[PDB]
């Protein structure tokens, strides 16, 4: 999430002043008797070819061009995040993005809106409350 996630710009090879972003849902692990804390997620991955080296035509200022940008596009919630989508992208000599049609995801997910009303339990209906339950 460091470089400008807008598609209407070729990413810079360097990142800019953003740094990598935060997240709504940082987790931590202790599976070793020691902490891990997990603050980051991707947004984009970029492929670079050192053109004038590969051409073997120049040696100063070897800026590789971006051949293509992967987009890694996420759904966010305060406890979880996951990909909504991904795309192949590449950039024209005029700087326009050109894009593949995305691949898109969805996941069965928690909710608080839809909850059903309560139901009686004939099968058990009295067999609890101190001694009458055991299980």
């Amino acid at each position: 999430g460091e470089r400008d996630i807008s598609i209407n710009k070729i990413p810079t090879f360097e990142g800019g002043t953003t740094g990598w972003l935060a997240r709504p849902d940082m987790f931590s692990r202790y599976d070793f008797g020691i902490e891990i804390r997990n603050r980051r997620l991707c947004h984009q991955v970029l492929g670079f070819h050192r053109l004038e080296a590969l051409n073997d035509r120049d040696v100063t200022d070897e800026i590789p061009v971006l051949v293509n940008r992967l987009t890694l596009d996420y759904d966010l919630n305060n406890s979880v995040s996951t990909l909504v989508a991904v795309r192949q992208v590449a950039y024209e000599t005029d700087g326009s993005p050109i894009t593949q049609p995305p691949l898109e995801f969805d996941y069965q997910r928690f909710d608080t809106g839809s909850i059903p009303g309560w139901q009686e339990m004939p099968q058990l209906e009295a067999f609890n409350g101190y001694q009458p339950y055991q299980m």
Partner: protein, 34 residues
Amino acid sequence: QRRIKSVSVSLPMLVGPYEDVCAQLTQTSSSYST
């Protein structure tokens, strides 16, 4: 020889929370002239 000292009963049942099941037992007669 054998003589009865005491008795108790148990019923595999379901009962309402505050349901006081009502029943009773009685002895008609006994051997050995007790």
